[PDB]
Amino acid sequence: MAFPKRLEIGGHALVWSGDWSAAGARKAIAGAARAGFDYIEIALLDPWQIDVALTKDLLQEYNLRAHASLGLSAATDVTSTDPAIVAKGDELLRKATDVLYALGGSELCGVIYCALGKYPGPASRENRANSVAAMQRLADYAADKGINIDLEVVNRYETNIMNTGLEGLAFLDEVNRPNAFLHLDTYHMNIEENGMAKSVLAAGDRLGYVHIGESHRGYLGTGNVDFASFFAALKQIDYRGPITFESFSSEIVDPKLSNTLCVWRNLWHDSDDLAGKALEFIKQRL
Amino acid sequence: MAFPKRLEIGGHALVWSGDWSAAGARKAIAGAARAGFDYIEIALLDPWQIDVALTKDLLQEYNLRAHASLGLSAATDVTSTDPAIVAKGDELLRKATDVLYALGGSELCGVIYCALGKYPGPASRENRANSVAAMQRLADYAADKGINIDLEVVNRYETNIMNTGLEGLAFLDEVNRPNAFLHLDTYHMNIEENGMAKSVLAAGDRLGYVHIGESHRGYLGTGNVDFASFFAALKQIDYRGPITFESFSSEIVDPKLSNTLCVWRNLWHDSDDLAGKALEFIKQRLTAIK
Ligand SMILES: O=C(CO)[C@@H](O)[C@H](O)[C@H](O)CO
Ligand SMILES: O=C(CO)[C@@H](O)[C@H](O)[C@H](O)CO
Ligand SMILES: [Mn+2]
Ligand SMILES: [Mn+2]
């Protein structure tokens, strides 16, 4: 079975903090709460680094919910033809699920099905088969802990496995798990999709998670994304799931994410101004 | 001085051919000619590969003009803190210029100012200064051969040096050469620009070259690019320069370029259909009285 989802608006941690130190965690949770988000999305690329007790304390202090996203790396790539590397991926994904479970969360999303970043060539049948089997194992592990997994479709420079919602849905057909969902991100859609509606309408109840990012990943409404068409499509399918505002500036750097995402430019410096305008922007389109 | 530019529409070689063998050169030049393009843009990532005499004969046979684009690689990266790698870059750029000159061409464009692809971190002041100095030396070499150079602004995953038109213009001011121009590409703009007009309007006469690519680099008008604003901008600055249709499908693969551009998807397989529809699309928006 799937676990409950609700329409709720979140902020990604990199809007506020490049780390999850006591100070970094507080800055991000306080920032999301101040802006009036329902949840913070924690970037769990190293799930062993996060102090669960400290994080639970901060979420209670600020009356805030948490979901988690991550990308794997070459060392943890579940697409790998090296079985030791796939096993390191399974291990990281189980640890991320355990952290989310300890925080009382219900959603593990993002690039959980491969290494986030540049592949040297196209995926083989083996790469894909390895990824599908890894997401079956992860879905089954998460199901015991009341957690849905949401497979984020990202652009060609960030994966060779799935670059469109339609490809994502075909992948999910092969996974065939009730608690495995599609995750769409307007920034990635802006590059790869034939308009901003087709993949949402095709996905229907299988769309489990949404990222809102401008074309340049900066202030919403200052770039090229057709948000009107995207939000109309969400209304058509009566979408009732997480919507995270996601934005990257050289102002706030995570050394293990920011260089992978090639965030060379400062698109903003005022985290509170950006987040506050992002939430208002999203609520207006709902 | 700058060298003459004209409003002309071209097709990128990779629409037809992944190499420049006799058969490959003919397929691309015949293809560009059959679609009704004014010129072919030859990908010179390895300028020592080109049979110049064969290519000159083909361009004459089909009454077609040629421009050239390229990207450097790690071994030829003019941003490098290794002077030996910068020297290899200078040498490749000179050879590309020599090929274009022999073919009677006037435009060397694309990612001529760094290695095309993913950088592991942001560019240092030294990376940028090395690139600027290299583009000055290239501009001066090209100027003796009647050639303009056009620095192609590309997205964050393909360079760390310049990702917007506005960044391109500041870099170009540091180069300070009259035959050096900004080169904008709607595919890259779709990621990095605040709308499709700002950089064009800011560039004015400094815009020397244009690439037309859909958001996904497939059929024009099947993606997300606001071409209406882009072409409105070109009209407002009375743009008079090359406009190349550029498209990448796994159907046609240059091993030197296709994997760097992460072309994982086949968005087309009929070169003539893609190129014919692209020319129609571009012509309509150039004459579009709006
Ligand atoms: O869109 C992206 C990456 O481009 C993020 O959503 C990614 O999944 C990362 O894991 C965030 O933590
Ligand atoms: O836009 C691009 C690369 O994404 C091409 O135009 C590139 O500059 C190269 O010069 C092609 O040969
Ligand atoms: Mn995202
Ligand atoms: Mn281009």
Numbering used by the authors:
A (entry chain A): 1 to 286
B (entry chain B): 1 to 290
Quote the study on this structure.
The monomeric structure of MetLRE is similar to that of homotetrameric l‐ribulose 3‐epimerases, but the short C‐terminal α‐helix of MetLRE is unique and different from those of known l‐ribulose 3 epimerases.
The X‐ray structure analysis of l‐ribulose 3‐epimerase from Methylomonas sp. (MetLRE) revealed a homodimeric enzyme, the first reported structure of dimeric l‐ribulose 3‐epimerase.
